Amino acid sequence: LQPNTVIRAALDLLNEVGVDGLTTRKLAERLGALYWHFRNKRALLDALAEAMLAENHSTSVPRADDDWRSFLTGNARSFRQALLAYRDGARIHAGTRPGAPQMETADAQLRFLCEAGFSAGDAVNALMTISYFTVGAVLEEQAGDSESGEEAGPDAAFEQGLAVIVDGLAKRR
Amino acid sequence: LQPNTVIRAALDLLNEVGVDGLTTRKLAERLGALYWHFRNKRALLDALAEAMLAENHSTSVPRADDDWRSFLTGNARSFRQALLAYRDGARIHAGTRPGAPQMETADAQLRFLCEAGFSAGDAVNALMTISYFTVGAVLEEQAGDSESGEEAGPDAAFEQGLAVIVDGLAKRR
Ligand SMILES: Cc1c2c(c(O)c3c(O)cccc13)C(=O)[C@]1(O)C(=O)C(C(N)=O)=C(O)[C@@H](N(C)C)[C@@H]1C2
């Protein structure tokens, strides 16, 4: 794995300088006797990607009380907030692929949706599509804010698009 | 506005170095007697954002032969390809807001969907949501590729999520 004290420090610096200004040399200048090394920046951002979810993605895993709508909705809501908790959250996540630990739990997501009446390809599609929508929505929210140096709510807009998405999936539950 | 020879040169350099390596000083080192200036990088990326669409967003505007499904579908397909034509296309677009010229044509999109049976808030939601989904989908495609230094198709995956999206909107045409 890799130490928490180090990850916390990188997250906090990320809030200061965003992804573009975040480097491992600057990470060390923040910290200065337990050893750490990242294979490269991308590796740092993969770790932060994972950390963001560990800390905030709270209806990631299913629960007896869930039904399919309530899980995907909550799941999307919860993903989104993990992305929004940190500067450049969405950008960082892009192109990441869920890990070995994230795989076991990501297999639970499926075996629930199949349980509930979706086909295999439909279930992958429900997760990806929600995923693509969310990253998209957050990216636009985060950049619009981030770029302001040069109407009714990004939460509404998200919440709506997600409502539409859940309907079109219901057409094959 | 701002000169085409200059924009072409910036697009071509963008393909070489992505957004992170693109700066106005490097743009000039590419060119070196007609004058140009960008207020800042963000302004450069706003112009490139617009150029990408001017060049490739081909079922942006409606047409008598369109119906609503075929327009939103095509529209999304066409947007997406504009984003994919250039490195970091999606990232660049994030946070941009369609211009004065893009406004007149963006008003045509609506007055078509309202024409076809969507309410006002539904029509905004259809465009945004497709928009958020697309930027999301492309961002993940572009980064996954971009980051490779450290199953069945991103076109399928997009095409599917877009299919689901169009269904959930049909629930209020
Ligand atoms: C299934 C899947 C997912 C994600 C993902 O990136 C991904 C991928 O890049 C390739 C193949 C499959 C997936 C998510 O990012 C993620 O957000 C995620 O990792 C995830 C998670 N770790 O809990 C989720 O809950 C999912 N939710 C947004 C639908 C989604 C699931």
Ligand SMILES: Cc1c2c(c(O)c3c(O)cccc13)C(=O)[C@]1(O)C(=O)C(C(N)=O)=C(O)[C@@H](N(C)C)[C@@H]1C2
């Ligand atoms: C309506 C709207 C749109 C976009 C957009 O960014 C935006 C916004 O940032 C704030 C408020 C409204 C909009 C698009 O990016 C854009 O891609 C776009 O500019 C656009 C265009 N210029 O033709 C489109 O066709 C749209 N399509 C993806 C649904 C969508 C329309």
Ligand SMILES: [Mg+2]
């Ligand atoms: Mg991911």
Ligand SMILES: [Mg+2]
């Ligand atoms: Mg835009």
